[PDB]
Design a binder for this molecule. Structure first.
Ligand SMILES: OC[C@H]1O[C@@H](O)[C@H](O)[C@@H](O)[C@@H]1O
Lengths: 126, 130
């Protein structure tokens, strides 16, 4: 299924069409804010963005992207289901996807879940 | 590696080439090397699927279970890539019949004439490169 991910700053995770880094900066979920959750096997998930490419952790080396033409790895995630119904995403490197409060592009370099690393999600299409 | 994909049945198992050895099954718990298929352009808007053994997936015209042991493309090895309403995909062989996971209960087939629950697959492009 296709979902949007809403970050700590109340904006939505934006694939940026695979140009440059991903950001948590959109006011409303539209095509670029819809991600197909992929069952990558063994509790791991991947995310296919609007451009048909896959979200990568970049191993924490740089801000996260949505440009990979195929899942390997840096593109599989643990989908952690939090107490409050939110989700966190843990990358290949054991670090957590962070919305960075919209202050900078999204990262996967933080070793623990805090506010910025919890997302509200709901299924949506079109 | 943008055209090498896996196919996941709604039974949550992945389509498996069986490395040519016998019929294909939708029973693998994890998308491994036998679970990856390169989508080859077969012309006229049709596609072929080449398994890990470098050979081609065949419908067998629905007369027996599907196999991945053809050296080259003809047909029973061409398929329509059907994109479904829900994000899943289906594959319609040259006989007009659709590829079925058979819910992992028997080997994969291509003899059912319409798209039902076992003829819809989740897909993703994946690579073994690490
Ligand atoms: O409507 C498709 C996309 O257009 C872009 O210009 C916006 O930044 C995205 O947020 C939107 O999802």
């Amino acid at each position: 299924k296709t979902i949007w991910l809403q970050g700590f700053n109340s904006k939505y995770v934006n694939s940026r069409n695979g140009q440059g880094a991903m950001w948590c900066d959109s006011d409303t979920p539209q095509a670029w804010e819809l991600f197909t959750v992929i069952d990558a096997g063994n509790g791991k998930i991947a995310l296919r963005g609007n451009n048909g490419l896959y979200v990568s952790s970049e191993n924490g080396e740089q801000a996260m992207t949505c440009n990979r033409p195929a899942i390997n790895g840096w593109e599989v995630f643990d989908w952690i289901s939090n107490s409050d119904g939110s989700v966190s995403l843990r990358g290949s490197n054991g670090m957590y996807v962070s919305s960075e409060n919209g202050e900078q592009a999204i990262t996967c370099n933080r070793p623990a879940i805090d506010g910025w690393e919890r997302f509200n999600w709901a299924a949506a299409t079109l």
